[PDB]
């Protein structure tokens with residue numbers, strides 16, 4: 245029993261992930277059957293009870309077209325559900341890759357980070373923040389399943405469900421007329437969460453290096469309060485960590501956004517600029 | 521020549537406002553012709569080139585149903601355009617009312633502010649900020665055109681095109697799974713623009729009292745830079761202003777968001793709690 249979604253199909257058995265409002269299946273083109281796809285099914289009624297808008301991810305994925313961001317191939321609307329047909333990542337997620345490898349070398353981390361940074365450059369230039377980056381939505385794709393080493397992995401960022409747009413300066417003036425009544429922080433495009441992804445990336449790199457996240461907690465409750473109470477945190481960096489990677493990690497893992505490394509500093513951090 | 525929009529109609533001659541992506545016409549129910557409506561026409565192609573999502577205003581207007589917020593009656597989608605059929609405000613905007621009256625008494629300001637505050641309470645409870653409040657989208661409605669004095673005016677907030685949702689604490693955990701990789705400012709719901717509307721309201725009240733906005737500028741450019749350069753501003757309050765209204769104005773018109781009065785303080789400000 246295959247479900248049909250435009251020119252594609254999937255089995256409901258082939259679940260490859262899910263969240264509150266969506267499930268994702270491995271599927272394929274119905275005729276070009278070696279063209280695998282990831283089909284995301286969103287329940288409309290469940291979604292309208294959140295603040296999440298239905299067309300946000302669609303629009304973002306079209307605007308973010310790039311080799312380190314999952315592609316969107318088709319949208320199919322039904323009475324109850326919307327289907328997004330997107331790029332399938334045949335390597336699964338970074339979480340599983342880490343479980344299998346334990347910890348990554350600094351050389352491997354550098355290669356992955358170069359790709360994550362490329363993704364982040366395209367988000368940055370469109371004023372998009374992801375806000376929920378984690379090993380579960382940083383995905384691995386192998387172009388040939390023969391080339392199965394690090395140099396055959398292409399990283400692709402997924403799940404923009406919790407993402408948001410940041411306006412620029414005239415992005416406020418150009419559509420909202422005279423700004424005379426507009427709050428200064430809106431006119432000036434001041435955004436508390438503009439560096440959210442940089443923290444995330446920090447936690448992920450740290451976990452690649454060390455084998456655990458830098459600040460664990462038994463629940464969402466504990467982690468909120470731990471971050472509430474401790475207004476300044478030092479992650480534990482192993483002594484063996486190269487000086488520049490440690491510098492990068494401590495810059496990313498700044499509890500206070502204003503003290504956190506910004507994108508240009510991240511993109512041009514000396515750890516990232518290397519040869520082999 | 522009347523255009524038809526579901527059970528309603530309008531003339532293209534009866535333009536009552538516009539912006540970058542929309543025009544609004546006075547119209548009416550086709551059979552109950554004394555039921556006036558405001559019909560907003562949005563060009564789809566123009567809109568998709570902005571960051572603005574098409575269904576945002578629709579969803580917000582449904583969630584904000586309230587007597588000081590324009591109602592949404594119908595949505596009609598066409599190949600090129602979406603039409604929103606909304607509550608018509610037969611009194612026009614506050615801008616025109618101010619042009620005609622010059623300046624308002626403190627008693628009148630108190631009555632208008634009570635209604636604006638009621639609107640703000642419903643936004644606040646749904647975590648919505650408007651971000652572009654101004655005299656042009658704070659509208660006047662008269663239920664009987666006979667009762668034409670202040671006590672016959674009902675204030676209604678309009679144009680949520682530039683509005684945004686703020687998540688709550690578990691609004692992050694409840695949909696985005698484990699928050700272990702999530703930025704602290706995202707987990708904690710820290711928002712630079714959470715008080716944007718309070719500044720706006722400040723500028724509007726000030727203009728009602730004084731007859732001009734507190735910080736004029738020849739362009740959007742000047743106003744941005746003036747706010748960039750001057751990190752602390754004192755609005756000029758007339759000596760005749762009642763002490764508590766002056767206090768309220770200076771609390772709202774804080775250039776720096778962190779020093780600005782918050783919603784609960786605004787809603788319970790002693791100027792607002794009065795009898796006649």
Ligand SMILES: O=C(NCCCNc1nc(Nc2cccc(CN3CCOCC3)c2)ncc1C1CC1)C1CCC1
Pocket residue numbers: 260261262263266267268282283284314330331332333334335336337380381383402403
């Ligand atoms: O997209 C989400 N999470 C990311 C993981 C699931 N989605 C994807 N998974 C994948 N592939 C995948 C993810 C996890 C596991 C696997 C299955 N493994 C493949 C290799 O090893 C065998 C099993 C494959 N590719 C693409 C995608 C996204 C839609 C474009 C959210 C879950 C609701 C949306």
Ligand SMILES: O=C(NCCCNc1nc(Nc2cccc(CN3CCOCC3)c2)ncc1C1CC1)C1CCC1
Pocket residue numbers: 536537538539542543544558559560590606607608609610611612613656657659678679
């Ligand atoms: O909604 C917008 N701006 C607010 C003013 C235009 N819209 C409205 N105007 C009004 N009425 C209105 C506004 C300005 C002028 C007038 C015309 N006057 C009526 C009384 O005196 C005679 C002329 C009437 N009512 C409702 C609405 C909004 C859609 C629900 C934006 C313009 C693109 C969206």
Ligand SMILES: [Cl-]
Pocket residue numbers: 407408409
């Ligand atoms: Cl957004």
Ligand SMILES: [Cl-]
Pocket residue numbers: 683684685
């Ligand atoms: Cl939003």
